Design a protein around this ligand. Sequence first.
Ligand SMILES: *[C@@H]1O[C@H](CO)[C@@H](O[C@@H]2O[C@H](CO)[C@@H](O[C@@H]3O[C@H](CO)[C@@H](O)[C@H](O[C@H]4O[C@H](CO)[C@@H](O)[C@H](O)[C@@H]4O)[C@@H]3O)[C@H](O)[C@H]2NC(C)=O)[C@H](O)[C@H]1NC(C)=O
Ligand SMILES: *[C@@H]1O[C@H](CO)[C@@H](O[C@@H]2O[C@H](CO)[C@@H](O[C@@H]3O[C@H](CO)[C@@H](O)[C@H](O)[C@@H]3O)[C@H](O)[C@H]2NC(C)=O)[C@H](O)[C@H]1NC(C)=O
Ligand SMILES: *[C@@H]1O[C@H](CO)[C@@H](O[C@@H]2O[C@H](CO)[C@@H](O[C@@H]3O[C@H](CO)[C@@H](O)[C@H](O)[C@@H]3O)[C@H](O)[C@H]2NC(C)=O)[C@H](O)[C@H]1NC(C)=O
Ligand SMILES: *[C@@H]1O[C@H](CO)[C@@H](O[C@@H]2O[C@H](CO)[C@@H](O[C@@H]3O[C@H](CO)[C@@H](O)[C@H](O)[C@@H]3O)[C@H](O)[C@H]2NC(C)=O)[C@H](O)[C@H]1NC(C)=O
Ligand SMILES: *[C@@H]1O[C@H](CO)[C@@H](O[C@@H]2O[C@H](CO)[C@@H](O[C@@H]3O[C@H](CO)[C@@H](O)[C@H](O)[C@@H]3O)[C@H](O)[C@H]2NC(C)=O)[C@H](O)[C@H]1NC(C)=O
Ligand SMILES: *[C@@H]1O[C@H](CO)[C@@H](O[C@@H]2O[C@H](CO)[C@@H](O[C@@H]3O[C@H](CO)[C@@H](O)[C@H](O)[C@@H]3O)[C@H](O)[C@H]2NC(C)=O)[C@H](O)[C@H]1NC(C)=O
Ligand SMILES: *[C@@H]1O[C@H](CO)[C@@H](O[C@@H]2O[C@H](CO)[C@@H](O)[C@H](O)[C@H]2NC(C)=O)[C@H](O)[C@H]1NC(C)=O
Ligand SMILES: *[C@@H]1O[C@H](CO)[C@@H](O[C@@H]2O[C@H](CO)[C@@H](O)[C@H](O)[C@H]2NC(C)=O)[C@H](O)[C@H]1NC(C)=O
Ligand SMILES: *[C@@H]1O[C@H](CO)[C@@H](O[C@@H]2O[C@H](CO)[C@@H](O)[C@H](O)[C@H]2NC(C)=O)[C@H](O)[C@H]1NC(C)=O
Ligand SMILES: *[C@@H]1O[C@H](CO)[C@@H](O[C@@H]2O[C@H](CO)[C@@H](O)[C@H](O)[C@H]2NC(C)=O)[C@H](O)[C@H]1NC(C)=O
Ligand SMILES: *[C@@H]1O[C@H](CO)[C@@H](O[C@@H]2O[C@H](CO)[C@@H](O)[C@H](O)[C@H]2NC(C)=O)[C@H](O)[C@H]1NC(C)=O
Ligand SMILES: *[C@@H]1O[C@H](CO)[C@@H](O[C@@H]2O[C@H](CO)[C@@H](O)[C@H](O)[C@H]2NC(C)=O)[C@H](O)[C@H]1NC(C)=O
Ligand SMILES: *[C@@H]1O[C@H](CO)[C@@H](O[C@@H]2O[C@H](CO)[C@@H](O)[C@H](O)[C@H]2NC(C)=O)[C@H](O)[C@H]1NC(C)=O
Ligand SMILES: *[C@@H]1O[C@H](CO)[C@@H](O[C@@H]2O[C@H](CO)[C@@H](O)[C@H](O)[C@H]2NC(C)=O)[C@H](O)[C@H]1NC(C)=O
Ligand SMILES: *[C@@H]1O[C@H](CO)[C@@H](O[C@@H]2O[C@H](CO)[C@@H](O)[C@H](O)[C@H]2NC(C)=O)[C@H](O)[C@H]1NC(C)=O
Ligand SMILES: *[C@@H]1O[C@H](CO)[C@@H](O)[C@H](O)[C@H]1NC(C)=O
Ligand SMILES: *[C@@H]1O[C@H](CO)[C@@H](O)[C@H](O)[C@H]1NC(C)=O
Ligand SMILES: *[C@@H]1O[C@H](CO)[C@@H](O)[C@H](O)[C@H]1NC(C)=O
Ligand SMILES: *[C@@H]1O[C@H](CO)[C@@H](O)[C@H](O)[C@H]1NC(C)=O
Ligand SMILES: *[C@@H]1O[C@H](CO)[C@@H](O)[C@H](O)[C@H]1NC(C)=O
Ligand SMILES: *[C@@H]1O[C@H](CO)[C@@H](O)[C@H](O)[C@H]1NC(C)=O
Lengths: 224, 208, 394, 52, 40
Amino acid sequence: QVQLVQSGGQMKKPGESMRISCRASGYEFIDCTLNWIRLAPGKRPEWMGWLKPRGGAVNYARPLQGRVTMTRDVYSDTAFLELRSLTVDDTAVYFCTRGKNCDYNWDFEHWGRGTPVIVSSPSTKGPSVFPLAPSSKSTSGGTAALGCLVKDYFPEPVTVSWNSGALTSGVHTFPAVLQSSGLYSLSSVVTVPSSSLGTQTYICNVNHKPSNTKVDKKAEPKSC
Amino acid sequence: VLTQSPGTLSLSPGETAIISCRTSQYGSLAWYQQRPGQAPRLVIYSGSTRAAGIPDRFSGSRWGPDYNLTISNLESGDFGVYYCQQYEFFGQGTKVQVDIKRTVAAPSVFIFPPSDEQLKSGTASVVCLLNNFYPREAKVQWKVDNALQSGNSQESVTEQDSKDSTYSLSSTLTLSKADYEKHKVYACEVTHQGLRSPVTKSFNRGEC
Amino acid sequence: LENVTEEFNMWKNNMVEQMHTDIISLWDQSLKPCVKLTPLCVTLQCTNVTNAITDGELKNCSFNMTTELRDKKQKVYSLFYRLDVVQINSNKEYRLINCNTSAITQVCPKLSFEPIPIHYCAPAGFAILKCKDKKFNGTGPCPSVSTVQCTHGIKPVLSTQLLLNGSLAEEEVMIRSENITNNAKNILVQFNTPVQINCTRPNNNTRKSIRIGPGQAFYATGDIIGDIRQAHCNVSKATWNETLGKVVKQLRKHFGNNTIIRFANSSGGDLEVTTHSFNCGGEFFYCNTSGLFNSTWISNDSITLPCRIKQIINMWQRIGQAMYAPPIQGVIRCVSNITGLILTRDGGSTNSTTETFRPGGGDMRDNWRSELYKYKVVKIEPLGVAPTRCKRRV
Amino acid sequence: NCTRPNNNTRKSIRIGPGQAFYATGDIIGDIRQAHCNVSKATWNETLGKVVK
Amino acid sequence: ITDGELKNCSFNMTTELRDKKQKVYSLFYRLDVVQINSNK
Ligand SMILES: *[C@@H]1O[C@H](CO)[C@@H](O[C@@H]2O[C@H](CO)[C@@H](O[C@@H]3O[C@H](CO)[C@@H](O)[C@H](O[C@H]4O[C@H](CO)[C@@H](O)[C@H](O)[C@@H]4O)[C@@H]3O)[C@H](O)[C@H]2NC(C)=O)[C@H](O)[C@H]1NC(C)=O
Ligand SMILES: *[C@@H]1O[C@H](CO)[C@@H](O[C@@H]2O[C@H](CO)[C@@H](O[C@@H]3O[C@H](CO)[C@@H](O)[C@H](O)[C@@H]3O)[C@H](O)[C@H]2NC(C)=O)[C@H](O)[C@H]1NC(C)=O
Ligand SMILES: *[C@@H]1O[C@H](CO)[C@@H](O[C@@H]2O[C@H](CO)[C@@H](O[C@@H]3O[C@H](CO)[C@@H](O)[C@H](O)[C@@H]3O)[C@H](O)[C@H]2NC(C)=O)[C@H](O)[C@H]1NC(C)=O
Ligand SMILES: *[C@@H]1O[C@H](CO)[C@@H](O[C@@H]2O[C@H](CO)[C@@H](O[C@@H]3O[C@H](CO)[C@@H](O)[C@H](O)[C@@H]3O)[C@H](O)[C@H]2NC(C)=O)[C@H](O)[C@H]1NC(C)=O
Ligand SMILES: *[C@@H]1O[C@H](CO)[C@@H](O[C@@H]2O[C@H](CO)[C@@H](O[C@@H]3O[C@H](CO)[C@@H](O)[C@H](O)[C@@H]3O)[C@H](O)[C@H]2NC(C)=O)[C@H](O)[C@H]1NC(C)=O
Ligand SMILES: *[C@@H]1O[C@H](CO)[C@@H](O[C@@H]2O[C@H](CO)[C@@H](O[C@@H]3O[C@H](CO)[C@@H](O)[C@H](O)[C@@H]3O)[C@H](O)[C@H]2NC(C)=O)[C@H](O)[C@H]1NC(C)=O
Ligand SMILES: *[C@@H]1O[C@H](CO)[C@@H](O[C@@H]2O[C@H](CO)[C@@H](O)[C@H](O)[C@H]2NC(C)=O)[C@H](O)[C@H]1NC(C)=O
Ligand SMILES: *[C@@H]1O[C@H](CO)[C@@H](O[C@@H]2O[C@H](CO)[C@@H](O)[C@H](O)[C@H]2NC(C)=O)[C@H](O)[C@H]1NC(C)=O
Ligand SMILES: *[C@@H]1O[C@H](CO)[C@@H](O[C@@H]2O[C@H](CO)[C@@H](O)[C@H](O)[C@H]2NC(C)=O)[C@H](O)[C@H]1NC(C)=O
Ligand SMILES: *[C@@H]1O[C@H](CO)[C@@H](O[C@@H]2O[C@H](CO)[C@@H](O)[C@H](O)[C@H]2NC(C)=O)[C@H](O)[C@H]1NC(C)=O
Ligand SMILES: *[C@@H]1O[C@H](CO)[C@@H](O[C@@H]2O[C@H](CO)[C@@H](O)[C@H](O)[C@H]2NC(C)=O)[C@H](O)[C@H]1NC(C)=O
Ligand SMILES: *[C@@H]1O[C@H](CO)[C@@H](O[C@@H]2O[C@H](CO)[C@@H](O)[C@H](O)[C@H]2NC(C)=O)[C@H](O)[C@H]1NC(C)=O
Ligand SMILES: *[C@@H]1O[C@H](CO)[C@@H](O[C@@H]2O[C@H](CO)[C@@H](O)[C@H](O)[C@H]2NC(C)=O)[C@H](O)[C@H]1NC(C)=O
Ligand SMILES: *[C@@H]1O[C@H](CO)[C@@H](O[C@@H]2O[C@H](CO)[C@@H](O)[C@H](O)[C@H]2NC(C)=O)[C@H](O)[C@H]1NC(C)=O
Ligand SMILES: *[C@@H]1O[C@H](CO)[C@@H](O[C@@H]2O[C@H](CO)[C@@H](O)[C@H](O)[C@H]2NC(C)=O)[C@H](O)[C@H]1NC(C)=O
Ligand SMILES: *[C@@H]1O[C@H](CO)[C@@H](O)[C@H](O)[C@H]1NC(C)=O
Ligand SMILES: *[C@@H]1O[C@H](CO)[C@@H](O)[C@H](O)[C@H]1NC(C)=O
Ligand SMILES: *[C@@H]1O[C@H](CO)[C@@H](O)[C@H](O)[C@H]1NC(C)=O
Ligand SMILES: *[C@@H]1O[C@H](CO)[C@@H](O)[C@H](O)[C@H]1NC(C)=O
Ligand SMILES: *[C@@H]1O[C@H](CO)[C@@H](O)[C@H](O)[C@H]1NC(C)=O
Ligand SMILES: *[C@@H]1O[C@H](CO)[C@@H](O)[C@H](O)[C@H]1NC(C)=O
C-alpha cells in the first residue's frame, strides 16, 4: 500500500541546517519520480524540486539554489531533503508526494502527512498599544468603535480585553493587517452604546505575553 | 500565470459553487482540495477528469484559456481551500466560506479618531466600523476628500457573528502624524443587496 | 513507396525499450562463467605510493589470501585506486568497496567488449518502414517512406551526457523533445558536424595475478614502471565554441527572442550522472566536463578535461551487482567525436529573460532513441475484398 | 479457525557479501501455544452423514 | 510462558570481513534443535 511516512516535527532557529525524510513504501522506489511541495499557510503553494531514483539525478527550483539539497538512500527506500540558512519565512509544512502512474510527473495522487518546520527568531518588538477613542460623549442611539490597535507587534499571538473583561459581547476582533514592514498590526473594535462611553474609563487591556509585558491604556473621548 | 477568482466564496449549503481559473500557456490542469488541515487530494485532473473516490458533482470546462470548477449541492466536506495547478505553478487559493441565510441588513458608517495617548507620538490610526452587514460579498470604499487613498490597508473581516448572524467590515489607514492634516475629510461608502446607494455619513473632526 | 504517407512517433516506439531489455541481458548471461571475488574482502592495511607523482589518488595496499593449499596463509599486495578503498577506523585499515551490499564478479579477461555494429532484421510477415525526409521533430507525417529489411548500423555505446560516435544530422542541428514546456523530460540535440575529443592516460601499468583456489585466478595491478600523472581529455575551443552557437540558434527558435541562454554543470546526484563515462580499450573513465557548459549567450587552444578511473563499477544502476574491471598493459590513446548532447532545463521562477540548461542524464534509453527514430514496424495483412463486375458460373 | 498469539519479531544477519539470513528476533508479549477451533454441532452432525 | 517448546540459542557467525568472528543469537523452535551431549 502506497504510503509515504514522513519523520519529524519540528522547530528550528535561523541559520541552521535541517533534515527531513520520506520513507516510501508500496511501490518500486527505484522506478518513480518523487516531488516536493512547500505548502506555506496563507500563501501560494510552491514546488521545490524532484529527485529521480536509480540515478539520484535532481532538479531544484530557481529561488532555492545554493540552499536546498536532495538525496536518497536506495537501500532503505528513504528520500531526504535538507535546507541550509533557514529564515523565519521558511515556516510551512513540507509535503513529499508522488504521482499516480510513473509516466506523468505532475499529478499528485499520493501525499504525505506533512512536516511542519517552524523557525523562531529572538526579536522583542514590544508593546505599542493604540486605543481608539469615542468622540461621541453620549449620542443617544449611537454606537461607538471603542477599540484598540496594536502597531508592529511580534511574535504571535496578541489579545485585547476591556477593564478586566467588562466588554465581552460585540468585540469584533478584526484580523491582523500584515503591514509592509513584515510586522503585523492588530485591529479590534467594540460596539459600545451611547451612555456607556463615559460611564467608566474602559481600559484597553492588550496582553503582550510573547514579550512578557503588557500595556493598558484608555480610550476616553477627545477634546480636539 | 495562474489566477484564481473570487478569493472568497460565501455560500450556503445545498447551493452550487463556481470557481474559475484562466491560464495562458498550453498544458493540463488539475484541481486539489485542501480539506482544512489534512493532506490535500486531487479532485479533478487532466482538465476535466475526476479522480478515484471523488463524487460526480465535480466537473470541468471550458474552451481556450478559461476553466471552471463546479460544486453542485454544496455539503459540509466541501468547505475548504481550492487550488488550481498547471505543471508546477499553483494558484493563490480560493476559500469557500459557509454562510447562513439572513434577511438583508441595515448599514451604519462609524468612524472614530485615535486617542490622545499615542496619537501625539508621531503616528495615526483611523478605523471605519461597518456594523450589520449582509451579505459577505461587498466592497469597501474608504474615501478621503472623495478619493480612494487606502494604500497598505486591508479589508479584514470577522465571521458571521452568530449572536446576530451579521458581518462587520472595516478599512484603516497607516499614515504618520506629520502629514495627517491632508486627510481630515473621511467617508465610507458600502453597498449591499438591500441598498440602492452606498451608505455614507459625514463626520467632522472639529466636533469633540 | 511513392505517395505513401505514414505518421511516426519516436517516443512511443517500442524498438528502443526492447533493445534496452536485450542489451542488459547480454551483460548478465555472459558473466555466468567468470570466477568471482568473495575472498577479495580483507582488512587490507595500506599506505601511500611513493613514486615521482604530480598527484593520494593511488594507493599501495597489502592483504592476506589463501594459497594452493587451503590451509596456509599467503601475504600478497597490489595497487588500488582511491575509490576502491574505504576507511573503517597506528596505521590504516581499509575495506574493499561494495562488500556490504553486493557480490563482486570479475569480468573474464579474455572477452572483448568492443562495440561491433548491430543490424536488426524483421522476420517474415513483418516489415520495417523508414522516414528518409528531414525536418522531423519525431512526430507528425512523413512524405518519404521506404521499406527495408534491416535497420542500419546501431552501435551499443553506453555513454552519458554527450553522445559519442553517433549519426550526424542532415543540415542543421536537430533538437527533439517530447514536450519543451515539460521539465521532467530530456532534450536531445543532434550535431550536423562532429567535435573531436582525445582522451589519454600516461598509465603504463603492470599486471599481476594471484591464484585464489584451485583453478581460479584474480588479475590485479602490478607496479608502476614510469611516473604518475593524471588523465585528461582535450577538446578544441574553436570547433566547440562555434557549435554551441548553432545550438543556441535552434533553442532560440522555440523559446522566442531576447532569451538569455545559460549553460551550467550538473547540480547533483550519483557519480554516474554528474560526469561523463567512457570505455576506451577496456577501461572506464569519469571525466569532469564542467567547462564545456559554462557560458552565457545574448543578442591551437584546447580545453583539458580531468578524469577519474574506477575499477569496481555498476553499469546498469542496479542493486547488489558489481563487476571488477581487469587492468590492461600499455598507455591508452583513444580518439572519438561527439555528435550530441542530452540537456535538461531547470524549472522555477517566471522570468522570461533567462533560461538555464544543464547536462541531463540518468537513463540509458536515450542513447538509442536518438537512432531508432527513423523506423516503424508494420504488420502485413494479405486478404482483402472489393466489389467487381464478375460472376462465378457454376 | 486457526490462530496463534505469536506477535514475534524479525532480525537479520549478514552472512557473506550480499547474502542475508532472516532469523527470529525477540518476543514482544507473552507466550501461549497455538490452537485451532471447530464447533461440536456442525462436526458431530457431519459424521452422521458419513456414517450413513 | 504458559508453555520448553521455545529456546534462546547463541552462535558464532562470520561478519562482513571474512576474518572476524561475530557472536550472534536468535530464537528456534524445539524441533529445530538437536542435542549432541556443564551447559548444553
Ligand atoms: C559545477 O561547478 C561548480 C562551480 O561553479 C562546482 O561547485 C564547487 O564545487 C567545489 C567542489 O567540487 C567546491 O569546492 C569546495 O570549496 C570549499 C570552500 O567552501 C573548500 O573548502 C573545499 O575543500 C575541500 O577539499 C579539500 C581538498 O581539496 C579538503 O582539504 C577540504 O577539507 C574540503 O573537503 C572544496 O574545494 C565549491 O564550494 C563549489 N562552489 C564554488 C562556487 O566553487 C560544482 O562542484 C560543479 N559540479 C560538479 C558536479 O562538479
Ligand atoms: C505539451 O503537452 C501539452 C498537453 O497536451 C500540449 O498542449 C496541447 O496543445 C495543443 C496545441 O496547442 C492544444 O490544442 C489546441 O487548443 C486550442 C485551444 O484554444 C484550440 O484552439 C486548438 O484548436 C487546439 O485544440 C491543446 O489544447 C493543448 N492541451 C491542453 C491540455 O491544453 C502541448 O502542445 C505540448 N507541447 C508541445 C511543444 O508539443
Ligand atoms: C608497496 O609496498 C610494498 C610493501 O611495503 C612494496 O613491496 C616491496 O618492495 C620492496 C622494495 O624496496 C621489496 O624489497 C626488496 O625486494 C627484493 C626482492 O624481494 C629484495 O631482494 C630486496 O632485498 C628488498 O627486500 C619487497 O620485497 C617488496 N615486497 C614486500 C612483501 O615487502 C611495493 O614495492 C610497494 N609498491 C610500489 C609500487 O613500489
Ligand atoms: C568511437 O569510434 C572510434 C572508431 O572506432 C573508436 O576508436 C577506436 O577505439 C579503439 C579502442 O580500442 C582503438 O583500438 C585500439 O587501437 C590501438 C592502435 O590502433 C591498439 O593498440 C589497441 O589494441 C586497440 O585495438 C582504435 O584504434 C580506435 N580507432 C579506429 C578504429 O579508427 C572510439 O573508441 C569510439 N569511442 C568509444 C567511446 O568507443
Ligand atoms: C569539475 O571542474 C570544476 C571546474 O574547474 C571544478 O570547480 C573548481 O574546483 C576547484 C577545486 O575544487 C576550485 O578551486 C578553489 O577555488 C577557491 C576559490 O576561492 C580557491 O580559494 C582555492 O584555492 C581553489 O583554487 C574552483 O574554484 C572550482 N570552481 C570554478 C573554477 O569555477 C570542480 O571542482 C570539478 N568537479 C569535480 C567533481 O571534481
Ligand atoms: C536470550 O539470551 C540472550 C543472551 O543470553 C539475550 O540477549 C541479551 O539480553 C540482555 C538482557 O538482559 C542484554 O543485556 C542488556 O543489554 C543492553 C543493550 O545490549 C545493555 O545496555 C544492558 O546493560 C544489558 O547488558 C544483552 O545485551 C543481550 N545480548 C547479549 C549478547 O548478551 C536475549 O535477550 C535472550 N532472549 C530473550 C528473548 O530475551
Ligand atoms: C596477514 O597475515 C598475518 C599472519 O596471519 C597477520 O599477522 C598477524 O597479525 C595479528 C594482528 O595483531 C597478530 O596478532 C598476529 O600475531 C600476527 N601473526 C603473525 C604470524 O605475524 C597479519 O595481521 C595479516 N594482515 C596484514 C595486513 O598483514
Ligand atoms: C556499506 O559500507 C559503507 C562504508 O562507507 C557505508 O557507507 C557509510 O554508511 C554510513 C552509515 O549509514 C553513513 O553515515 C556514511 O555516510 C556512509 N558513507 C561513508 C563514506 O562513510 C554504507 O552505508 C554501507 N552499506 C549499507 C547498506 O549500510
Ligand atoms: C609500458 O611498460 C612496459 C614495461 O612493462 C614497456 O615495455 C618495454 O618496451 C620497450 C620498448 O618500448 C622494451 O625495450 C622493453 O624491453 C619493454 N620492457 C619490458 C619489461 O618488456 C612499454 O614500452 C611501456 N609502454 C609505454 C612506455 O608506453
Ligand atoms: C592536451 O591539451 C593541452 C592543453 O594545451 C596540451 O598541453 C601541453 O602540451 C605540451 C606539449 O607536449 C606539454 O609540454 C604540456 O605539459 C601540456 N600541458 C598540459 C596541461 O597538458 C596537451 O599537449 C594536449 N595533449 C593531448 C594528448 O591532447
Ligand atoms: C585530438 O587528436 C587529433 C589526432 O591526433 C589531433 O589532430 C591532429 O593534431 C596535430 C597537432 O599536433 C596536427 O598536426 C594534425 O594535423 C591533427 N590531425 C591529425 C589527423 O593528426 C587534435 O589536435 C587533437 N585535439 C586536441 C589536442 O584538442
Ligand atoms: C566558469 O565561469 C566563471 C565566470 O566567468 C569563470 O570564472 C572566472 O574565470 C577567469 C578565468 O578562468 C578568472 O580570471 C576569473 O577570476 C574567474 N572569476 C572569478 C570571480 O574569480 C570560470 O573560469 C569558468 N570556468 C570554466 C571552466 O569555463
Ligand atoms: C506485534 O508486535 C508489534 C511490535 O513489534 C506491535 O507493533 C506496535 O503496534 C502498536 C499499535 O497496535 C503501535 O502503537 C506500536 O508503536 C507498535 N510497536 C512498534 C515497535 O512498532 C504490534 O501491534 C503487535 N501486534 C499485535 C499486538 O497483534
Ligand atoms: C477457541 O475455543 C475455545 C474453547 O472454548 C475458546 O475458549 C475460551 O474463550 C475465552 C474467551 O476469550 C477465554 O477467556 C479462554 O481462555 C478460552 N479458552 C481456551 C482454552 O481457548 C476460545 O475463545 C476460542 N478461540 C478462538 C480464537 O476460536
Ligand atoms: C470460527 O471463526 C468464525 C469467524 O469469526 C466464528 O464465527 C463467528 O463467531 C462469533 C462468536 O463470537 C459470532 O458472533 C459470529 O456471528 C460468527 N460469524 C461471523 C461471520 O463472524 C466462529 O464462531 C469460529 N468457530 C469456533 C470458535 O469454533
Ligand atoms: C597518505 O595519504 C593520506 C590520504 O590519502 C594522507 O592523509 C596522508 O597525509 C598521506 N601521507 C603521506 C606521507 O603521504
Ligand atoms: C566563445 O564564443 C563567443 C561567441 O562566439 C565569443 O564571443 C567568445 O570570445 C568565445 N570565447 C573563446 C575563448 O573562444
Ligand atoms: C525573432 O528574431 C528573428 C531574428 O532573425 C526574427 O526573424 C523573428 O521574426 C523574431 N520573432 C519574433 C516573434 O519577434
Ligand atoms: C568521427 O570519428 C570517426 C572515428 O573517430 C572518424 O572516422 C570520422 O571521420 C569522424 N568524423 C565524421 C564522421 O565527420
Ligand atoms: C455426538 O453425536 C451423537 C449422535 O448424534 C450424540 O449422541 C452425542 O451426544 C454427540 N455428542 C456431543 C458432545 O455433541
Ligand atoms: C530447560 O529446558 C530443558 C529442556 O527443555 C529442561 O530439561 C530444563 O529443566 C529447563 N530448565 C529450566 C531452568 O527451565
